[PDB]
Amino acid sequence: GKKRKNNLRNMNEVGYDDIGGCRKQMAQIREMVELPLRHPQLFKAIGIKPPRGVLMYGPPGTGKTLMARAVANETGAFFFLINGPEVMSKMAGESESNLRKAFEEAEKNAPAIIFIDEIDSIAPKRDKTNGEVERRVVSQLLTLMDGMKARSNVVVIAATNRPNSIDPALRRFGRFDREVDIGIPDATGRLEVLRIHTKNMKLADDVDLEALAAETHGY
Amino acid sequence: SGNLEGEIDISSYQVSTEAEALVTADMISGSTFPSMAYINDTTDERYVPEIFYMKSNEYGITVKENAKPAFPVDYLLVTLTHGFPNTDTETNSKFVSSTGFPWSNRQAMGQSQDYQELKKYLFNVASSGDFNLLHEKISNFHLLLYINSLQILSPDEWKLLIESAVKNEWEESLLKLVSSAGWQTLVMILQESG
Ligand SMILES: Nc1ncnc2c1ncn2[C@@H]1O[C@H](COP(=O)(O)OP(=O)(O)OP(=O)(O)O)[C@@H](O)[C@H]1O
């Protein structure tokens, strides 16, 4: 069926059918995440080291988390989620422990995917990292990512609002080197989104979703 | 109480200087939980402020937690270490005793100090001599207290008795005591008593 599959076919029930209007970026993230994990033999045969980090960004509400969760569920790999706020709400000295745990658990269950949602809230711009705790957490994250090179079949995905909001040290070789940009959709994309969302509403007979898609620009 | 292996080990403790200053103003009471001590209220005589007990967490950070209902008493203790003198015979003890004449008010058991026990314990040595034997029978803390309570010997006689029983130089004092009139009356009545 679908997703390793009424039996064969609430954030673990999202697939590629719940996303519309982002074919290009979806293809990029898929070819960057699935192939290293689903088919690691290609890279062994061709003798290359696939990049690990992936950094998505775009305006809020563009479905970054939706895409990450959909890719994780479709790949069928051990998925570990890290939220910037909830990591940064822990008592002093516990955020680093949470990061170390997350990464150790991900490593021990390879293949795995680590999704750091809203990474700009735990590794913000170096100017905004005013405080001992901010520096300690940023350093812990950098150490964990640097020490992951030995780890294999583990991919880290980070989502941020803008490229200039995270610490510049996270955008180097051996770190979030690949980048993806999500933009507002076009008329076809908006029509697809409308069809996705209004697939359960009791729409009246006189609905012109095409007209709505035409009228709704910048949404 | 007994150690982890099932023995009769002994432990020594001492309460801190703030627990000592906390109980004086009441402010503490025992709780149904053995390890935790309760806290009293702000009555019209005793005024109890908010009590915080400070602890350090596993991350090396001190954390203050309000404990009005009850707090552990481990913050009100300091632990000492006990021991016994090395087997090397230093003999700095004040008494070669603690095995003999019955102790203090143990009337519940058969240990009842009385003239018969003296007649059976401290009379054969006083009827023979062997001043060393008499000295090692006379150096019992509880025996000294008992004979003092008997009040047969006058204060000076008892002072020379204690200094004969506790001082490393006792020959002359022991001879003076055994020759003293008070001791002679004591031993005579003890012999006559049955
Ligand atoms: N194609 C689509 N693109 C974007 N959002 C979509 C799409 N289809 C449905 N949605 C809905 O739009 C909302 C997107 O919210 P989402 O949390 O994914 O965005 P985000 O701001 O990028 O995420 P986050 O703050 O968690 O990183 C969700 O309701 C999702 O169900």
Coordinates of C-alpha atoms and ligand atoms in Angstrom, one line a residue:
Chain A
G1 CA 0.0 0.0 0.0
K2 CA 1.3 3.4 1.1
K3 CA 3.8 4.1 3.9
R4 CA 5.0 0.5 4.4
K5 CA 1.4 -0.8 4.1
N6 CA -8.7 0.6 5.1
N7 CA -5.9 -1.2 6.9
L8 CA -3.5 -0.7 4.0
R9 CA -4.7 2.9 3.3
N10 CA -2.0 13.0 14.5
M11 CA 1.3 14.0 12.8
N12 CA 2.4 10.4 12.0
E13 CA -0.4 10.1 9.4
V14 CA 1.1 12.6 6.9
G15 CA 2.5 11.5 3.5
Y16 CA 3.2 13.0 0.1
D17 CA -0.5 13.2 -0.6
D18 CA -1.0 15.8 2.2
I19 CA 1.3 18.3 0.4
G20 CA 0.6 20.3 -2.7
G21 CA 2.3 23.0 -4.7
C22 CA 6.0 22.3 -3.8
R23 CA 7.1 19.8 -6.4
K24 CA 10.6 21.2 -6.8
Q25 CA 11.6 21.5 -3.1
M26 CA 9.9 18.2 -2.3
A27 CA 12.0 16.5 -5.0
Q28 CA 15.1 18.1 -3.7
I29 CA 14.5 17.0 -0.1
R30 CA 13.5 13.5 -1.2
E31 CA 16.6 13.0 -3.3
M32 CA 18.7 14.3 -0.5
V33 CA 17.1 12.2 2.3
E34 CA 15.6 9.0 0.9
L35 CA 18.5 7.9 -1.3
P36 CA 21.2 8.0 1.5
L37 CA 19.0 5.9 3.7
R38 CA 16.8 3.8 1.5
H39 CA 19.6 3.0 -1.0
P40 CA 23.0 3.5 0.6
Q41 CA 24.6 1.1 -1.9
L42 CA 24.6 3.7 -4.7
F43 CA 27.0 6.0 -2.8
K44 CA 29.2 3.0 -1.8
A45 CA 29.4 1.9 -5.5
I46 CA 30.2 5.4 -6.8
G47 CA 32.6 6.2 -3.9
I48 CA 31.2 9.4 -2.5
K49 CA 30.2 10.7 0.9
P50 CA 26.6 12.0 0.8
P51 CA 26.0 15.3 2.5
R52 CA 24.3 15.1 5.9
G53 CA 22.8 18.4 6.9
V54 CA 19.8 20.0 5.2
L55 CA 18.6 23.5 6.0
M56 CA 15.1 24.4 4.9
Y57 CA 13.8 27.9 5.2
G58 CA 10.9 30.1 4.1
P59 CA 8.1 32.2 5.4
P60 CA 6.2 30.7 8.3
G61 CA 3.2 28.7 7.3
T62 CA 4.9 27.3 4.2
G63 CA 4.7 23.7 5.4
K64 CA 8.3 23.1 6.4
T65 CA 7.4 20.9 9.3
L66 CA 4.7 19.2 7.1
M67 CA 7.4 18.4 4.5
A68 CA 9.9 17.1 7.1
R69 CA 7.3 14.8 8.8
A70 CA 6.0 13.6 5.5
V71 CA 9.5 12.7 4.2
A72 CA 10.3 11.0 7.5
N73 CA 7.2 8.9 7.5
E74 CA 7.5 7.9 3.8
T75 CA 11.2 6.9 4.3
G76 CA 10.2 4.6 7.1
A77 CA 13.2 5.4 9.2
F78 CA 13.6 6.0 13.0
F79 CA 12.5 9.7 13.3
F80 CA 13.6 11.8 16.2
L81 CA 12.1 15.3 16.7
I82 CA 13.9 18.3 18.3
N83 CA 12.0 21.5 19.0
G84 CA 13.9 24.7 19.7
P85 CA 11.5 26.1 22.2
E86 CA 11.0 23.0 24.3
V87 CA 14.8 22.3 24.3
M88 CA 15.4 25.9 25.3
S89 CA 12.7 25.8 28.1
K90 CA 14.7 23.3 30.1
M91 CA 16.6 24.2 33.3
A92 CA 20.2 25.4 33.0
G93 CA 22.4 22.4 32.2
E94 CA 19.6 20.2 30.9
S95 CA 19.3 21.5 27.3
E96 CA 22.7 20.1 26.6
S97 CA 21.7 16.8 28.1
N98 CA 18.6 16.7 26.0
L99 CA 20.6 17.4 22.8
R100 CA 23.2 14.7 23.7
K101 CA 20.4 12.2 24.4
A102 CA 18.6 13.0 21.1
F103 CA 21.8 12.5 19.1
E104 CA 22.9 9.3 20.9
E105 CA 19.5 7.7 20.5
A106 CA 19.5 8.7 16.8
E107 CA 22.9 7.2 16.3
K108 CA 22.1 4.0 18.2
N109 CA 19.0 3.3 15.9
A110 CA 20.5 4.0 12.5
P111 CA 19.1 4.6 9.9
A112 CA 17.6 7.7 11.5
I113 CA 16.4 11.2 10.8
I114 CA 16.9 14.2 13.2
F115 CA 14.6 17.1 12.6
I116 CA 15.6 20.3 14.5
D117 CA 12.5 22.4 14.1
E118 CA 13.1 26.2 14.6
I119 CA 16.8 25.8 15.0
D120 CA 17.2 29.6 15.2
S121 CA 15.8 29.5 18.7
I122 CA 18.7 27.4 20.1
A123 CA 21.6 28.5 17.8
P124 CA 20.6 32.1 17.0
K125 CA 22.9 34.7 15.3
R126 CA 26.2 35.1 17.3
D127 CA 25.2 38.7 18.1
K128 CA 21.9 37.4 19.6
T129 CA 23.7 34.7 21.7
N130 CA 24.1 37.0 24.7
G131 CA 24.4 34.7 27.7
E132 CA 26.3 31.8 29.1
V133 CA 23.5 29.3 28.5
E134 CA 23.1 30.3 24.8
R135 CA 26.8 29.9 24.2
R136 CA 26.9 26.5 26.0
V137 CA 24.0 25.2 24.0
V138 CA 25.3 26.4 20.7
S139 CA 28.7 24.9 21.4
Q140 CA 27.0 21.6 22.4
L141 CA 25.1 21.5 19.1
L142 CA 28.2 22.3 17.1
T143 CA 30.2 19.5 18.9
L144 CA 27.4 17.0 18.3
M145 CA 27.2 17.8 14.6
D146 CA 31.0 17.7 14.1
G147 CA 31.2 14.4 15.8
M148 CA 28.5 12.9 13.6
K149 CA 30.8 12.5 10.6
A150 CA 31.7 9.0 11.9
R151 CA 28.0 8.2 12.3
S152 CA 26.5 6.8 9.1
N153 CA 22.9 6.6 7.8
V154 CA 21.9 9.6 10.0
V155 CA 20.5 12.7 8.4
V156 CA 19.9 16.0 10.2
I157 CA 17.2 18.4 8.9
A158 CA 16.8 22.0 10.3
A159 CA 14.0 24.5 9.6
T160 CA 14.4 28.2 10.1
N161 CA 12.6 31.3 9.0
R162 CA 15.5 33.0 7.2
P163 CA 19.1 32.0 6.3
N164 CA 20.5 35.0 8.3
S165 CA 18.8 34.0 11.6
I166 CA 21.0 31.0 12.6
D167 CA 24.6 31.1 13.8
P168 CA 26.9 31.4 10.7
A169 CA 29.1 28.5 12.0
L170 CA 26.2 26.1 11.2
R171 CA 26.5 26.6 7.4
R172 CA 29.9 25.1 6.7
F173 CA 31.3 21.8 5.4
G174 CA 30.3 18.9 7.6
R175 CA 27.3 20.9 8.8
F176 CA 24.1 22.3 7.3
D177 CA 25.7 22.7 3.9
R178 CA 22.7 21.9 1.6
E179 CA 20.0 24.5 1.7
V180 CA 16.4 24.6 0.4
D181 CA 14.1 27.7 0.0
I182 CA 10.3 27.5 0.2
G183 CA 8.3 30.2 -1.6
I184 CA 4.6 31.1 -1.8
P185 CA 2.8 28.9 -4.4
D186 CA 1.3 29.9 -7.7
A187 CA -2.3 29.5 -8.8
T188 CA -1.9 25.7 -9.4
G189 CA -0.3 25.2 -6.1
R190 CA -3.0 27.2 -4.3
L191 CA -5.7 25.1 -6.0
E192 CA -3.9 21.9 -4.9
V193 CA -3.8 23.2 -1.3
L194 CA -7.5 24.1 -1.4
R195 CA -8.4 20.7 -2.7
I196 CA -6.2 19.1 0.0
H197 CA -7.9 21.0 2.8
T198 CA -11.5 21.0 1.5
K199 CA -11.6 17.2 1.0
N200 CA -13.9 16.7 4.0
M201 CA -15.9 19.9 4.3
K202 CA -19.5 19.8 3.1
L203 CA -19.0 22.1 0.2
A204 CA -22.1 23.4 -1.6
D205 CA -22.7 22.7 -5.3
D206 CA -21.7 26.2 -6.4
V207 CA -18.0 26.1 -5.5
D208 CA -15.4 27.5 -7.9
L209 CA -12.1 26.5 -6.3
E210 CA -10.4 27.8 -9.4
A211 CA -11.9 31.2 -8.8
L212 CA -10.7 31.2 -5.2
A213 CA -7.2 30.1 -6.4
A214 CA -7.2 33.0 -8.9
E215 CA -8.4 35.5 -6.2
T216 CA -6.1 34.3 -3.4
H217 CA -2.6 35.7 -4.1
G218 CA 0.1 35.9 -1.5
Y219 CA -1.6 33.2 0.6
Chain B
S1 CA 20.8 -0.2 65.1
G2 CA 22.8 -2.6 62.9
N3 CA 24.8 -2.4 59.7
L4 CA 23.9 -3.5 56.1
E5 CA 25.0 -7.1 56.7
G6 CA 23.0 -7.8 59.9
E7 CA 25.3 -6.8 62.8
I8 CA 25.1 -4.6 65.9
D9 CA 27.3 -1.8 64.6
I10 CA 27.0 1.6 66.3
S11 CA 26.8 5.0 64.8
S12 CA 27.3 8.5 66.2
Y13 CA 25.7 11.8 65.0
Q14 CA 25.4 15.4 66.0
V15 CA 22.7 18.0 65.1
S16 CA 23.8 21.2 63.4
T17 CA 23.9 24.6 65.0
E18 CA 20.7 25.8 63.2
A19 CA 18.6 22.8 64.2
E20 CA 19.8 23.6 67.7
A21 CA 18.6 27.2 67.2
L22 CA 15.4 26.0 65.5
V23 CA 14.0 23.8 68.3
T24 CA 14.5 26.5 70.9
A25 CA 11.8 28.6 69.2
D26 CA 9.6 25.4 68.9
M27 CA 9.1 25.6 65.1
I28 CA 9.6 21.9 64.5
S29 CA 7.9 18.7 65.3
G30 CA 8.0 15.0 64.5
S31 CA 6.1 13.7 61.5
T32 CA 4.4 10.4 60.7
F33 CA 7.1 10.0 58.0
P34 CA 10.2 9.0 59.9
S35 CA 12.6 10.9 57.6
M36 CA 10.8 14.3 57.6
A37 CA 10.1 16.9 60.2
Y38 CA 6.9 19.0 60.3
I39 CA 6.7 22.8 60.8
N40 CA 4.4 24.7 63.1
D41 CA 2.2 27.8 62.5
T42 CA 2.4 31.5 63.2
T43 CA 0.6 31.7 66.5
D44 CA 0.4 34.8 68.7
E45 CA 3.7 34.0 70.6
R46 CA 5.9 32.1 68.1
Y47 CA 6.4 33.7 64.6
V48 CA 7.7 31.2 62.0
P49 CA 9.0 32.7 58.7
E50 CA 9.2 30.8 55.4
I51 CA 11.7 28.0 55.6
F52 CA 13.8 27.0 52.5
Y53 CA 16.1 24.1 52.4
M54 CA 19.0 24.4 49.9
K55 CA 20.2 21.4 47.8
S56 CA 22.4 21.0 44.8
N57 CA 21.1 19.1 41.8
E58 CA 23.0 16.6 39.6
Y59 CA 24.0 19.5 37.3
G60 CA 25.9 21.3 40.0
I61 CA 23.3 24.0 40.6
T62 CA 21.9 24.9 44.0
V63 CA 18.1 24.8 44.2
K64 CA 15.9 26.3 46.9
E65 CA 12.6 24.5 47.6
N66 CA 10.0 25.8 49.9
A67 CA 9.2 23.2 52.6
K68 CA 6.3 24.3 54.8
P69 CA 4.6 20.9 55.1
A70 CA 7.7 18.9 55.8
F71 CA 11.4 18.6 54.9
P72 CA 14.0 15.9 55.3
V73 CA 16.1 16.0 58.4
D74 CA 19.3 15.1 56.6
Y75 CA 20.1 18.8 56.4
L76 CA 20.2 19.0 60.3
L77 CA 22.8 16.3 60.9
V78 CA 26.6 15.9 60.9
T79 CA 28.1 12.4 61.1
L80 CA 31.0 11.5 63.4
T81 CA 33.2 8.4 63.4
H82 CA 33.4 6.0 66.3
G83 CA 36.2 3.5 67.2
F84 CA 38.0 1.7 69.9
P85 CA 41.5 2.1 71.3
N86 CA 44.2 0.0 69.5
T87 CA 44.9 -3.4 71.0
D88 CA 48.2 -2.0 72.3
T89 CA 47.8 -1.9 76.1
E90 CA 47.9 1.8 76.9
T91 CA 45.7 1.4 80.0
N92 CA 44.7 5.1 80.2
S93 CA 41.2 4.0 81.2
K94 CA 39.9 5.2 84.6
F95 CA 38.3 1.9 85.5
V96 CA 39.1 -1.8 85.1
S97 CA 35.4 -2.5 85.5
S98 CA 32.0 -2.8 83.6
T99 CA 31.8 -6.5 84.4
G100 CA 30.7 -7.3 87.9
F101 CA 28.7 -5.2 90.4
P102 CA 25.3 -4.5 88.8
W103 CA 24.8 -1.2 87.0
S104 CA 22.3 1.6 87.7
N105 CA 18.6 1.4 88.0
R106 CA 18.0 -1.9 86.3
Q107 CA 15.4 -3.0 88.8
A108 CA 13.4 -4.5 86.0
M109 CA 15.9 -7.4 85.7
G110 CA 17.6 -9.2 88.6
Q111 CA 20.2 -6.4 88.8
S112 CA 19.3 -4.9 92.1
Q113 CA 22.1 -3.2 94.1
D114 CA 22.0 -4.2 97.7
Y115 CA 24.1 -5.2 100.7
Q116 CA 24.0 -8.8 99.7
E117 CA 25.7 -8.1 96.4
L118 CA 28.4 -6.2 98.1
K119 CA 28.9 -9.0 100.6
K120 CA 29.3 -11.4 97.7
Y121 CA 31.4 -9.1 95.5
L122 CA 33.6 -6.8 97.6
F123 CA 34.1 -8.8 100.8
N124 CA 36.3 -11.8 99.9
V125 CA 39.0 -9.4 98.7
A126 CA 38.6 -7.2 101.8
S127 CA 38.9 -10.3 104.0
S128 CA 42.2 -11.6 102.5
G129 CA 44.4 -8.7 101.3
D130 CA 46.1 -8.7 97.9
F131 CA 45.9 -4.9 97.6
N132 CA 46.0 -5.2 93.8
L133 CA 42.9 -7.4 93.8
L134 CA 41.2 -5.0 96.1
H135 CA 42.1 -2.1 93.9
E136 CA 40.8 -3.8 90.8
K137 CA 37.6 -4.6 92.6
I138 CA 37.2 -1.1 94.0
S139 CA 37.6 0.7 90.6
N140 CA 34.0 0.2 89.4
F141 CA 32.1 3.4 88.6
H142 CA 28.8 2.1 89.7
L143 CA 30.2 0.6 92.9
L144 CA 31.7 4.0 93.8
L145 CA 28.3 5.6 93.2
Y146 CA 26.5 3.0 95.2
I147 CA 28.9 3.2 98.2
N148 CA 28.5 7.0 98.1
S149 CA 24.8 6.7 98.2
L150 CA 25.2 4.5 101.2
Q151 CA 26.6 7.5 103.0
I152 CA 28.5 5.4 105.6
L153 CA 31.8 7.0 104.7
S154 CA 32.3 10.7 105.5
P155 CA 33.1 13.1 102.6
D156 CA 36.9 13.0 103.2
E157 CA 36.9 9.2 103.3
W158 CA 35.0 9.0 100.0
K159 CA 37.4 11.6 98.4
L160 CA 40.4 9.4 99.4
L161 CA 38.4 6.4 98.1
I162 CA 37.8 7.9 94.7
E163 CA 41.4 9.0 94.4
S164 CA 42.5 5.5 95.4
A165 CA 40.3 4.0 92.8
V166 CA 41.0 6.3 89.9
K167 CA 44.6 7.5 90.4
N168 CA 47.6 5.6 89.1
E169 CA 49.3 6.0 92.5
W170 CA 47.0 4.2 94.9
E171 CA 49.1 2.1 97.3
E172 CA 49.4 4.7 100.1
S173 CA 45.9 5.9 99.6
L174 CA 44.5 2.4 99.5
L175 CA 46.3 1.5 102.7
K176 CA 45.1 4.7 104.4
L177 CA 41.5 3.9 103.3
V178 CA 41.5 0.3 104.5
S179 CA 43.0 1.5 107.8
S180 CA 40.4 4.3 108.1
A181 CA 37.8 4.0 110.8
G182 CA 34.9 4.6 108.3
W183 CA 36.1 1.8 106.0
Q184 CA 36.5 -0.5 109.1
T185 CA 32.9 0.2 110.2
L186 CA 31.7 -0.4 106.6
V187 CA 33.5 -3.7 106.3
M188 CA 32.4 -4.8 109.7
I189 CA 28.7 -4.1 109.1
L190 CA 29.0 -5.7 105.7
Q191 CA 30.4 -8.9 107.2
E192 CA 27.7 -8.9 109.9
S193 CA 25.0 -8.3 107.3
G194 CA 23.7 -11.4 105.6
Ligands
LIG1 N1 1.2 22.3 0.6 C1 1.2 22.9 1.9 N2 2.0 23.8 2.2 C2 2.0 24.4 3.4 N3 1.1 24.2 4.4 C3 0.2 23.2 4.0 C4 0.2 22.5 2.8 N4 -0.8 21.6 2.8 C5 -1.4 21.7 4.0 N5 -0.8 22.7 4.8 C6 -1.2 23.1 6.1 O1 -0.6 24.3 6.4 C7 -0.1 24.4 7.7 C8 1.4 24.5 7.7 O2 1.9 24.6 9.0 P1 3.4 24.1 9.4 O3 3.5 23.8 10.8 O4 3.7 23.0 8.5 O5 4.2 25.3 8.9 P2 5.6 26.0 9.4 O6 5.3 27.4 10.0 O7 6.6 26.0 8.3 O8 6.1 25.1 10.6 P3 6.9 25.1 11.9 O9 6.7 26.3 12.7 O10 6.5 23.8 12.7 O11 8.4 24.8 11.5 C9 -0.6 23.1 8.4 O12 -2.0 23.3 8.7 C10 -0.6 22.2 7.2 O13 -1.6 21.2 7.4

